[PDB]
Design a protein around this ligand. Sequence first.
Ligand SMILES: NC(=O)c1cc2c(NC(=O)[C@@]34C[C@@H]5C[C@@H](C[C@@](N)(C5)C3)C4)cccc2[nH]1
Length: 228
Amino acid sequence: ILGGREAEAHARPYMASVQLNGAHLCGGVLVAEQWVLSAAHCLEDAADGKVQVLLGAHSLSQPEPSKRLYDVLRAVPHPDSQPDTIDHDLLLLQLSEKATLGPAVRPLPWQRVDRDVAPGTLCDVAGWGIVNHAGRRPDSLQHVLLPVLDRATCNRRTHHDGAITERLMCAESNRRDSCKGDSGGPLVCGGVLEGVVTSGSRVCGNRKKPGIYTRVASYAAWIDSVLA
Ligand SMILES: NC(=O)c1cc2c(NC(=O)[C@@]34C[C@@H]5C[C@@H](C[C@@](N)(C5)C3)C4)cccc2[nH]1
């Protein structure tokens, strides 16, 4: 997270750290008792490596009573996702068992109505991604409040030049932004999950290249199919 601040410990009980061989790789969001939603590019080239999900965490390294590392039974990338595209960039992770719920571990209600979030809506994005241009990794969860950017501005030649489909959404990136390692994390608007940070490498903190987030409402039927 660039231009953000340390999040209040355990105030986002849905927050997941998707890890490969014990290292934070991507953000994630607990969407059901046994299911964590993330971005599909996260799992690319992971084939062999041990994928796990850390729930109830604030610090990645320190012991916390609510902190629990879960093994993964199944990794389900969207069938239409592709290495060289930003489309259908969603990944569903089935934990080895249903998560132990409590004040620091709870699924987040997610948007099923396929209508756009209003431009200007202040949304929350959290993560353990880099915090500066040098690549400094924070030990504890960071967050930033970002206003949603209308699709037409986001689609200008100066910005993302027509790459923003109706299944994608944008947020402003003026100094405050998601960055490397925030990929797959949640964009929460009015206490409801609206987007998943895309996992395509993108410049961070540049106003002319807004944040791109996959709209969960656009994939409601796919998320339901997988969980079933
Ligand atoms: N979303 C953003 O804001 C944003 C992402 C990003 C980035 N790249 C990643 O974060 C990942 C995401 C997953 C897991 C890891 C390998 C990878 N190929 C797939 C790329 C790291 C690099 C530089 C700036 C960036 N900015």
